[PDB]
Amino acid sequence: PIVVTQAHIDRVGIAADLLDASPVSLQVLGRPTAINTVVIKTYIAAVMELASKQGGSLAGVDIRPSVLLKDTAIFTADVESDVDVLDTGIYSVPGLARKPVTHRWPSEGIYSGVTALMGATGSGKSITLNEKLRPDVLIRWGEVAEAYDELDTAVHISTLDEMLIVCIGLGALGFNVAVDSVRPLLFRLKGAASAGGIVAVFYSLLTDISNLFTQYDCSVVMVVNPMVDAEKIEYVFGQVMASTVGAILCADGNVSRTMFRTNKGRIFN
Amino acid sequence: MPIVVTQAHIDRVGIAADLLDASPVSLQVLGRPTAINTVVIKTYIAAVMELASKQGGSLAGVDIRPSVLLKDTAIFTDVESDVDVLDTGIYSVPGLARKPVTHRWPSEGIYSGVTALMGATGSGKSITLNEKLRPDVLIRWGEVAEAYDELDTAVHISTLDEMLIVCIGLGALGFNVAVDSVRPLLFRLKGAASAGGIVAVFYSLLTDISNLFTQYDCSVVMVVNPMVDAEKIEYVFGQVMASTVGAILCADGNVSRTMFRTNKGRIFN
Amino acid sequence: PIVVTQAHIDRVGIAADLLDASPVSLQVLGRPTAINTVVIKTYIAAVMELASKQGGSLAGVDIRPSVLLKDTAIFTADVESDVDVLDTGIYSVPGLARKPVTHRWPSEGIYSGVTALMGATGSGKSITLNEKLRPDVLIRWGEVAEAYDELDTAVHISTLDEMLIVCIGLGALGFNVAVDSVRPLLFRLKGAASAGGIVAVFYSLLTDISNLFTQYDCSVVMVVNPMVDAEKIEYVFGQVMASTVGAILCADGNVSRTMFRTNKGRIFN
Amino acid sequence: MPIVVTQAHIDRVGIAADLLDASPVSLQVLGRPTAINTVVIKTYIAAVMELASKQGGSLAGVDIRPSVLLKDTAIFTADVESDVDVLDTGIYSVPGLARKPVTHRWPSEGIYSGVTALMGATGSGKSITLNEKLRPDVLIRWGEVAEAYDELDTAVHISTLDEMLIVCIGLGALGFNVAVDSVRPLLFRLKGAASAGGIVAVFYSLLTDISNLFTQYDCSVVMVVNPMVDAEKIEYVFGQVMASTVGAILCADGNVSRTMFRTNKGRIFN
Amino acid sequence: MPIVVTQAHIDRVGIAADLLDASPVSLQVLGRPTAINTVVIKTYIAAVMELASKQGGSLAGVDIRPSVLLKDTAIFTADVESDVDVLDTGIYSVPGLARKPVTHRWPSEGIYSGVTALMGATGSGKSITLNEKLRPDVLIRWGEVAEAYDELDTAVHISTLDEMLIVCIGLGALGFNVAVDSVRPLLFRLKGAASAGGIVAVFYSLLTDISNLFTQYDCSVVMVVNPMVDAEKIEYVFGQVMASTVGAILCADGNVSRTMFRTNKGRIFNGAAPL
Amino acid sequence: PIVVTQAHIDRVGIAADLLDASPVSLQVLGRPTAINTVVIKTYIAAVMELASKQGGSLAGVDIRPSVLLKDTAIFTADVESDVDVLDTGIYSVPGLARKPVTHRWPSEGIYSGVTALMGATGSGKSITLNEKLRPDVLIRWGEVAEAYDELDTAVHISTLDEMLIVCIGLGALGFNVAVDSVRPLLFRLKGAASAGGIVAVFYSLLTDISNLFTQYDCSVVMVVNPMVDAEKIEYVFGQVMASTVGAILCADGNVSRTMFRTNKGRIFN
Ligand SMILES: Nc1ncnc2c1ncn2[C@@H]1O[C@H](COP(=O)(O)OP(=O)(O)O)[C@@H](O)[C@H]1O
Ligand SMILES: Nc1ncnc2c1ncn2[C@@H]1O[C@H](COP(=O)(O)OP(=O)(O)O)[C@@H](O)[C@H]1O
Ligand SMILES: Nc1ncnc2c1ncn2[C@@H]1O[C@H](COP(=O)(O)OP(=O)(O)O)[C@@H](O)[C@H]1O
Ligand SMILES: Nc1ncnc2c1ncn2[C@@H]1O[C@H](COP(=O)(O)OP(=O)(O)O)[C@@H](O)[C@H]1O
Ligand SMILES: Nc1ncnc2c1ncn2[C@@H]1O[C@H](COP(=O)(O)OP(=O)(O)O)[C@@H](O)[C@H]1O
Ligand SMILES: Nc1ncnc2c1ncn2[C@@H]1O[C@H](COP(=O)(O)OP(=O)(O)O)[C@@H](O)[C@H]1O
Ligand SMILES: [Ca+2]
Ligand SMILES: [Ca+2]
Ligand SMILES: [Ca+2]
Ligand SMILES: [Ca+2]
Ligand SMILES: [Ca+2]
Ligand SMILES: [Ca+2]
């Protein structure tokens, strides 16, 4: 189950302050799109109200945004991925001038941001996540029917808006949020593939997502599975390390490599 | 050869309508998410049952084609394949929080979803499907004139809307539905080819199709034959295993490899 | 000459029937487009009247659609080849529930559909077509001035609409129709080339064309010579066999390989 | 150097007008089929004959350029992209001739009417072979830098594709031996995905459509075709072009490497 | 860690305003030339000086971010595609300086005004070289993950390209040693067909246009440029970048592998000078 | 300095006759665009008027078009680079029926047109141009701050319109005009790269530019440095020789190869 502590209740006000304090946007190959902070606040309030209906114990099924919110839109005519970058402009989510809030998960003293759980298909990513990492909230997206779907920690989403709502919303409150998988986004990323058989904007998106979590004191682990050649995975993992607060590589059911940006410094394996 | 409607099928009609109304679904490829009109599937089920009532329950595949039973066969209610992912949004069909309904076909105790019948051209996919699999309903799409077209189990469709209508409609009632083949969709998949000489959205589509069947308690076998190199088929089959409930590989008229997600767990050969 | 037998006259009524009974469309990378059946019927009527005015012995020049019909259009604002597959939908011409009508040409007991006469430039396709296959009607499209143009069996077309009119129109009556060539359609196929250096929709088009002939009891031989590498022709011929009722490979002025789907079964060489 | 108008040319004027009016033609590339205004070609022929009459039959290539003789040089009669559905634009190929083509003595004996492609790498001797070995009656110069051939009285300097077809169909139908050096402005602007041989497939369709356009109007034209292709891939492309033209000439190190001509005595390879 | 405003900076304010008004500039990429609103840069300089005055000369990078000081951060003043005819859009390059450019002591001695490009593969030590060896006065942080450099009082966190140019031209003209870590948000969103070296050709034109923009406004800027390029094509890309900037530094294995600086003493390739 | 001789003053009338006599246009991948001859005439008049106010000694800074003309536009709604060639038409600047005016620069007896100074980055193109070629007017465009910018012969431009104005305007008068560089145009050439890793229209543009100078009796040297592989430069240089009146290749600070079309014939090294 997903148990709501007094620590989570005390973070509600702070979470609302963090969201209102900084206006954020996101961009991919098109034009920068603003994130409606209000929706995340509304989600937190809905989760707290339901938590109150129960004994603080929540079922992942009951906290899905499609059930709690009338509208699940976070992004507020249509632009092509091959338009002039000077007509659309360029946006990256700004960094934190202050020291980021540290966490005990996925690693000790890790800064707020995003961790990428990498590896080839069947390398043990989902296994490593649920057995070794053991998240408080397990977001399930674009993955076939598995044993992890029967878990009361599992929250089934359909859109990118829903992913960010649950990640920012619950992550800000102090929950250890995880996403399995981020394949719906990755496999629909349109554009010319750069060095490593993957679009360059993929690395920019990971940085923008990481900083979005750093700003809202979230500690999120995302399963990032790329359609990349068996030997080109090492290059891509090195490139992802420069774009995320955390990075975990899986090979043959075990953890091959690690990288974490902590209060004790950047730790490699 | 005939398609017989048992009392078991009649008793599932109400449940099928209940599953369809309970969850609103959509589908996305490289464009924008498009909603699926559930009502059309319900209307199809009612038309099949009405005809089964007039006949002895012994129905001919020719008489149950949607173009004949329905006035309009549309299930989806103009965007380029190279448009910003943030302007269209991303959609994946949500997972099942509950345990999926098990089936005896194509394998014992297999969960509801999709099975991909893979193999090179002339590897014996169509032969394995009809002789070894023995499906109740055989959907024939984008295939040249063969002996399987003269079968009373054969239902000849033209559109993707029709495929989903027959698959969800009859599959929900408990019928063992099969599609030979899904080639018109695969060969019209526009986009930049990823690792393995195939567009990445192909794997996302298989998962979205699988989850669509998992949600509506369907057990469907689709023969998937995409344009891929003779040696690159092993990589693609491994990737498809991570995107479907079932996977069957054909080589020299026989079954080379198998993967099934059952109540007894994931079974490899 | 092109001689009209009583057997052809007796098929006129059956041809109008077949054409009215099933509404057909065609799709490539755009949106599905309906085929106006009336135009084919109008063409048959104009050919029969001219055959009745002359001695039954017609000249290919006199039966060209541009001469017999006021308008040659078969297809009834503008869509790009890179448009979302979900916005246009997917269409494949439906298969035949009944047994297809057999023919003695290009092979004994062959089912109605299309035969692809394949080979590199100067492999002997056009020689094999005119000397070994001996067609009744020879449609000449996208080819330079050759000896075959002076033939009384030769009918010179300009559009794809005209090709289908003569193929379906005369083919349905029992004539052995051949197209030399289909290069104006192949070389103008816009899209990203799949495995084998050729667009995947090419194989779907051959199946759709074949089934169009299977439905209207036609036996058509099309010379198909797409821009493909000298060594990649074997792979492409292999994929074409899985997309057509007949397949003939030319090399060094002679027949290299054959495949025919007959009443006695699929025959390979 | 001069362009002389014989009685044979004068006697063909009526026949040329008949050939043009008899068959309506179009052209297509990656967009939609575009009709060719036959009237413009007839108007050009009339202007050339009138000037030939004022002179002694002896004409200067400079004086017979379409931009000088016609007020409007347009042959093709809102805007479509090269990546549009083939089914929405339709497909057009210029129809073949049911009758025997009109044979010529140039570039080869008994060669049928149509187009000949003068191929070869850059500096292989295409322009040299064209002017020294071929000896054309009319030399169309297009998209080529300043050379000795521009000072020739046979040289007619054009700017558009419309102008090329006007001079090719107009003068070729009358019986003149017309040549184009070169067709690089069309080839280098051919938009589309490059097929096998590092060149767009529609290139081969265009050569056939151009060939048949000349076959129908009994024109004997030699076009120097030099597309951007790899040094070793030229052999493959030349073989493919042979299947798309009435004539084909390959140049290598200033000399003629290979030949192909479709004649009344049959197809002749070297 | 702090950003100190000297009398030298105060004396440059007028000079900077004149430089901006004297020459009208634009920028182009694959679309239509877009004009740069000089007024916004002047307004930013005035806001920085006014705040420097309220504080004791010393300023915090957080307080000088354009989003905080200006009501609108737009520098570029309907929508054109990256694949439009070059003749329908025309071509624009920022013009060169007819006079001798203002020399600087940073990033190299006697260097001309313009842009310096700090190259290297990922984890080659670009950010380390920038902060330890180069020591910039103002550190612009853009599209980079949470690092130790973000806690620095020299760090100014931006989000747009408009903001980058405002801080670079605005503070750089006054005499500050401005650095950008990273320029990746721009590089990773460069739409177009990749040329030789697995990178769009307009990338090199943009570096030259950015360099000349700084040469005209007497700025000395160091931009860290991380290219999505294969391990073996980095040498080719660097050679090409050297021909497009006033300064270029290559990083490999935590150290400086190669340098190029256009100084008053001439073009110096791989000099004996610690940064 | 830039000195105006009596020879230049005597050419003013002839330059107007040349510009008025032939209407010209330019095309790239879009539609043909007319060149407004009047603007070039206006520029010549402004240069001569200023040369008069001076002692015949002009500063390159004072003769820049942005300073002398109110509007710098030469080309007189918006078309895509991937539009049908038949809808835009094709334009090449026409050749000269007469013998071209000869020059003593960059080579003895060279015909009027364009010379391409080629070579890898840092091969010594700019060095060869200013030390060995010694041009009368050095147009500086899209190049970084160098010693050549402080030269009184240097004229700094921003647009392609400005380049052609100075090249045609001053070149027609007899000045030895050079451009360092043509990179702003070359690095913004949109389209599919042909053989040699460069767009085919690049070679057509060089010929069109060369013929534009041949028609207006100009002798211009352009630094052409396109993004091409280290080994592919030899192929491209050979192709450029077939597209220009002059061609110079640079390697390791020295001149590797030369080609000039003179009154004494085509001279190779
Ligand atoms: N093709 C295969 N054959 C055998 N076992 C496999 C195969 N693919 C995966 N497995 C098993 O599944 C485990 C990985 O499961 P999982 O965590 O779901 O992988 P991932 O999330 O990376 O796709 C492996 O350690 C192995 O035991
Ligand atoms: N090229 C070939 N040569 C010989 N036999 C072939 C060939 N291609 C297919 N076959 C025969 O057809 C069988 C496969 O039929 P089928 O099930 O229709 O294949 P698929 O559906 O995979 O295309 C093979 O087992 C073999 O007996
Ligand atoms: N490159 C060539 N060299 C020599 N003869 C050739 C060549 N190409 C074709 N031929 C001749 O033409 C014949 C093939 O003719 P044809 O059927 O028209 O070819 P295609 O396969 O292109 O339709 C060959 O048998 C040979 O006699
Ligand atoms: N790179 C070169 N080196 C030496 N001579 C050359 C070179 N390129 C061309 N030539 C000379 O020019 C002749 C070819 O001239 P030309 O007919 O104009 O060629 P093309 O029209 O095929 O481009 C060759 O036979 C040779 O004498
Ligand atoms: N894969 C790695 N394994 C070990 N150390 C690494 C790795 N990647 C980077 N480092 C360390 O980080 C340093 C580079 O840090 P940084 O300046 O942030 O690089 P950059 O800015 O070029 O991405 C290296 O000198 C090395 O000590
Ligand atoms: N990577 C380098 N290493 C050393 N010297 C170089 C390098 N690149 C250029 N140079 C020097 O600069 C000279 C070339 O200068 P320049 O004319 O500006 O070249 P270009 O115009 O072709 O880019 C060379 O002759 C050499 O002395
Ligand atoms: Ca998994
Ligand atoms: Ca099959
Ligand atoms: Ca042939
Ligand atoms: Ca030539
Ligand atoms: Ca860094
Ligand atoms: Ca230079």
Residue numbers in the entry:
A (entry chain K), C (entry chain I), F (entry chain A): 2 to 77, 84 to 276
B (entry chain J): 1 to 77, 85 to 276
D (entry chain B): 1 to 77, 84 to 276
E (entry chain L): 1 to 77, 84 to 281
What's written in the study?
The ɸ6 P4 was crystallised with ADP-Mg2+ bound in the nucleotide binding site, whereas P4 from ɸ8 and ɸ13 were crystallized in their apo form. As for ɸ12 P4, and other hexameric NTPases, the nucleotide binding sites in ɸ6 P4 are located at the interfaces between neighbouring subunits. The ADP phosphate groups are bound via the conserved Walker A (H1) motif residues (K132, S133); a conserved glutamate E150 (H1a) is positioned to catalyse the nucleophilic attack on the γ-phosphate, whereas D187, a conserved aspartate in the Walker B motif (H2), co-ordinates the magnesium ion. A sensor motif detecting the presence or absence of the γ-phosphate of NTP and modulating allosteric transitions of the RNA binding loop L2 in response to ATP binding and hydrolysis was identified in P4 from ɸ12 (N234). The equivalent residue in ɸ6 P4, N232, is positioned to contact the γ-phosphate of the NTP and might fulfil the same role. In ɸ6 P4, a much looser stacking of the nucleotide base is observed, with only one side chain (F275) stabilizing the adenine ring. In all P4 structures, the N-terminal domain covers the apical part of the hexamer, and in ɸ12 P4, an N-terminal domain α-helix projects from one subunit to the adjacent one, giving the hexamer a more rounded appearance. ɸ6 P4 lacks such a helix and might stabilize the hexamer by strengthening subunit interfaces with nucleotides. ɸ6 P4 is the only P4 that needs nucleotides and divalent cations to form hexamers. The structures of P4 from ɸ6 and ɸ13 show ordered L1 loops, which line the central channel and contact the L2 loops. The L2 loops are found with lysine residues (K239 and K265, respectively) projecting towards the centre of the channel, in the same position as K241 in ɸ12, suggesting a conserved mechanism for binding and translocating RNA. In P4 from ɸ6, ɸ12 and ɸ13, the arginine fingers are pointing towards the catalytic sites, making the subunits competent and primed for hydrolysis.
The lipid-enveloped bacteriophages of the Cystoviridae family infect Gram-negative bacteria, mainly plant-pathogenic Pseudomonas species and share similarities with the members of the Reoviridae family, including bluetongue virus and rotavirus. Their genome of ∼14 kb consists of three dsRNA segments small (S), medium (M) and large (L), which are sequentially encapsidated as ssRNA precursors into the icosahedrally symmetric procapsid by the packaging NTPase P4 (15–23). P4 is a protein of ∼35 kDa, which can assemble into a hexameric ring. NTP-binding sites are located on the external perimeter of the ring at the interfaces between adjacent subunits, whereas the nucleic acid binding sites are found in the central channel. P4 proteins are the only known RNA-specific helicases belonging to helicase Superfamily 4 (SF4).
